[PDB]
Structure 1
């Protein structure tokens, strides 16, 4: 097992900056392996009281091995910083791709949903705790394959999402906002919101004010535009159920006729 140090990397341009640190594009000096280096300030972690939580998250992520979950290759520290060595996804976020294309066709959508369901099934089997998944948590690797990232609760990605304010509420399920306990079935709700947003260009409970969005989520009040197809409507409708126990298993998603017919990944 190798013991890394900062001197082992050629640090490149920042990918992100926030209160808690900076992320850089980088390369290993010897091998020229391209990667991303997340650098967190110990002082900020301590001030926020999340040092312990972060270490736990990094340890868990370091052991995960899934094609659709961003790899954490290693980590190290010095007197003032913690350094996480992460996989570089060269094609950016699904958030940005959605901005570029406005909406996705059924093939791209079904493929992404397959990849996410696969990653989530792996997460559930390892009981990996994660925050609700949004397009900005979805990176794209060299093959245009989804990579889940920034999913730890410890520290929030300092990312200029722009849209409205926060933009997290749109992805939260009723049981969460209503203060009930929640379990892994929140992920099925997330997949439904994401499938819809991919095909439509906006999430199903979007409104001009958060007060309206809280209502619409609580009452599962949403509509399909005319162009959304029967199979897509079926999947999304099955996923966006108020009662979490009524949502399907991830295996059912991966076997859904609309998914099998359109996904480029079988």
Structure 2
């Protein structure tokens, strides 16, 4: 009655992770195509992030949204932990960005709309993703954006958080400055992401992380000349140093620049 490793044929690696690989998978009976996320228990327990894996599995499995990747189930075998994820045929936005160097305003606004919708749903359930980045954004069979990797996420209806969570180039100032943080970290990373979609590079990118920490804390960056006034306005609002001064996701979805370039409506 329970999941077993024998239930799946393992295909090519879909991507490498911090504690194991994600493989293309086939349920032997129904021939249903899936993604199998494999995590070694030794690496998880050594780094002491088992509690975070609990959060990833429990939170993602109970979420239901067209723009959020589905986690159908999980199982383990005293050596590895296996996550059964929804298959995203067109790969990452990261690979797409690398392929295209940069997105135009139509594509960028479309991705932001889909992402803001999914995040708005997350925050309504008091969930914070805390790891928004192109590598963690997948594309469906019709090119729809879907959030993935809830490996840094947390259910916080009560507490404000203290965990240094996320990825270097996308880390909010409050985390860097050793402050507490809330759901407003997703809107900072949304601003960092919108910049990278248009420019092709993170706004605080540097050779060292110490310099990156400095630039993030100062919110020290510039736009290339071709970035439109509407795009500059949206990004600047999302990249406020003061977390409470950052807009709401409802305000992002109703942003003039967003509604004039997006190919998809709001929730």
Q: What is the TM-score of this pair, normalised by structure 2? A: 0.88
Contact kept, 8 Å, 1:104 with 1:198, in 2: the verdict is yes
**Alpha carbons of structure 1 residues 90 and 157: separation in structure 2 relative to 1, 3 Å:** farther
Task: Extract unaligned runs of 5+ from structure 2.
Answer: none
Deviates more, 1:56-65 or 1:166-175: 166-175
Deviates more, 1:178-187 or 1:150-159: 150-159
Contact kept, 8 Å, 2:152 with 2:166, in 1: the verdict is no
Whole-Å Cα distance in 1 between the matches of residues 161 and 206 of structure 2? 16
Whole-Å Cα distance in 2 between the matches of residues 165 and 232 of structure 1? 29
Whole-Å Cα distance in 1 between the matches of residues 19 and 235 of structure 2? 37
Whole-Å Cα distance in 2 between the matches of residues 115 and 101 of structure 1? 20
Contact kept, 8 Å, 2:137 with 2:146, in 1: the verdict is yes
Q: CA deviation at 1:208?
A: 3.6
Contact kept, 8 Å, 1:93 with 1:137, in 2: the verdict is yes
Q: CA deviation at 1:198?
A: 0.5
Contact kept, 8 Å, 1:16 with 1:158, in 2: the verdict is no
Contact kept, 8 Å, 1:18 with 1:157, in 2: the verdict is no
**Alpha carbons of structure 1 residues 203 and 19: separation in structure 2 relative to 1, 3 Å:** closer
Contact kept, 8 Å, 2:105 with 2:198, in 1: the verdict is yes
Secondary structure of residue in 2 paired with 1:262: coil
Deviates more, 1:25-34 or 1:209-218: 209-218
**Alpha carbons of structure 1 residues 86 and 249: separation in structure 2 relative to 1, 3 Å:** same
Q: CA deviation at 1:261?
A: 0.7
Q: Give the superposed CA RMSD.
A: 5.5
Q: CA deviation at 1:12?
A: 1.1
Secondary structure of residue in 1 paired with 2:61: helix
**Alpha carbons of structure 1 residues 99 and 66: separation in structure 2 relative to 1, 3 Å:** same
Contact kept, 8 Å, 1:61 with 1:72, in 2: the verdict is yes
**Alpha carbons of structure 1 residues 174 and 79: separation in structure 2 relative to 1, 3 Å:** closer
**Alpha carbons of structure 1 residues 59 and 257: separation in structure 2 relative to 1, 3 Å:** same
Whole-Å Cα distance in 1 between the matches of residues 119 and 233 of structure 2? 21
Q: CA deviation at 1:82?
A: 2.1
Count of residue pairs brought into register by the alignment: 265
Whole-Å Cα distance in 1 between the matches of residues 118 and 163 of structure 2? 29
Q: CA deviation at 1:221?
A: 2.0
Secondary structure of residue in 2 paired with 1:15: strand
Q: CA deviation at 1:200?
A: 0.9
Contact kept, 8 Å, 1:50 with 1:154, in 2: the verdict is no
Q: CA deviation at 1:164?
A: 24
Tell me what 1:171 maps to. Answer: 170
Task: Extract unaligned runs of 5+ from structure 1.
Answer: none
Secondary structure of residue in 2 paired with 1:163: coil
Secondary structure of residue in 1 paired with 2:69: coil
Contact kept, 8 Å, 1:54 with 1:155, in 2: the verdict is no
**Alpha carbons of structure 1 residues 144 and 156: separation in structure 2 relative to 1, 3 Å:** farther
